[PDB]
C-alpha cells in the first residue's frame, strides 16, 4: 500500500536575450502539479525544460521534459543539478570534473561549460524526470 507523490511545477523564463540556457523564476504561485513515484523533500519541485541545451547529439533531457529538483539532496560531480549563477539567474546542467576542475556541462555541445566557483552555487539535485 505504498504512496505516490505530486510536486509543484514552477515557471521560469529566459534570463537574458542571447542566453536561453540561463533562466529566471517567474513571479506567482504554482498552478500545475505533477505526480511521480519518487519520494523527495517537501522543498522539491519540477521545472519544464524549454530549449535544447540539455538535448544530446544515453541520458537526454529534450525540450518539454519535466525534471524534479530537490534542494535538500547533496550534489556532487556526476549528478545533474540546477545551479544559481550571479544570485538570481539559474541553469540546468550536469556537474562534472574536468581535469579536477568543477564545471557545469550542458549535454548539447553547442552550449558552453561554466565553472562553478564564486558566483556559482547549487540550487538542488535533479532526481527524476517526466
Binding positions for Ca(2+) are: 42, 50, 63, 72, 76, 129
**For residues 1-33, b (16+ Cβ closer than 10 Å) or e, as one string?**
eeeeeebebbbbeebeeeeebbbeeeeeeeeee
**Binding of residue 129 to Ca ion (CB under 5 A):** yes
Question: Per-residue x/- marks for Ca ion, 43-72, CB under 5 A?
Answer: -------x----------------------
Other CB atoms within 10 Å distance of the CB of residue 109: 10
**Binding of residue 41 to Ca ion (CB under 5 A):** yes
* Span from 3-11, 33-41, 53-61, 94-102 in contact with Ca ion (CB under 5 A): 33-41
Identity of the residue, 83 or 95, whose beta carbon is nearer to Ca ion in the bound complex: 95
d(C-alpha 50, C-alpha 54), whole Å: 9
Q: Are strands 45-48 and 66-70 parallel, antiparallel or unpaired?
A: antiparallel
**Binding of residue 35 to Ca ion (CB under 5 A):** no
* Span from 15-23, 36-44, 86-94, 116-124 in contact with Ca ion (CB under 5 A): 36-44
* Span from 2-10, 53-61, 100-108, 122-130 in contact with Ca ion (CB under 5 A): 122-130
Residue holding cell 562553478?
A: 116
d(C-alpha 11, C-alpha 26), whole Å: 6
Residues at the interface with Ca ion (CB under 5 A): 41-42, 50, 129
Amino acid at each position: 500500500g505504498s504512496h505516490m507523490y505530486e510536486y509543484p511545477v514552477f515557471s521560469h523564463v529566459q534570463a537574458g536575450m542571447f542566453s536561453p540556457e540561463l533562466r529566471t523564476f517567474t513571479k506567482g504561485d504554482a498552478e500545475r502539479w505533477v505526480s511521480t513515484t519518487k519520494k523527495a523533500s517537501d522543498s522539491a519541485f519540477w521545472l519544464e525544460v524549454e530549449g535544447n541545451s540539455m538535448t544530446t547529439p544515453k541520458t537526454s533531457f529534450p525540450d518539454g521534459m519535466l525534471i524534479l529538483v530537490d534542494p535538500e539532496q547533496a550534489v556532487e560531480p556526476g549528478d545533474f543539478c540546477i545551479a544559481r549563477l550571479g544570485g538570481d539567474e539559474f541553469t540546468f546542467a550536469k556537474l562534472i570534473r574536468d581535469s579536477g576542475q568543477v564545471f557545469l556541462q550542458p549535454l548539447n555541445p553547442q552550449y558552453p561549460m561554466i565553472p562553478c566557483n564564486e558566483s556559482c552555487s547549487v540550487v538542488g539535485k535533479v532526481i527524476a524526470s517526466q
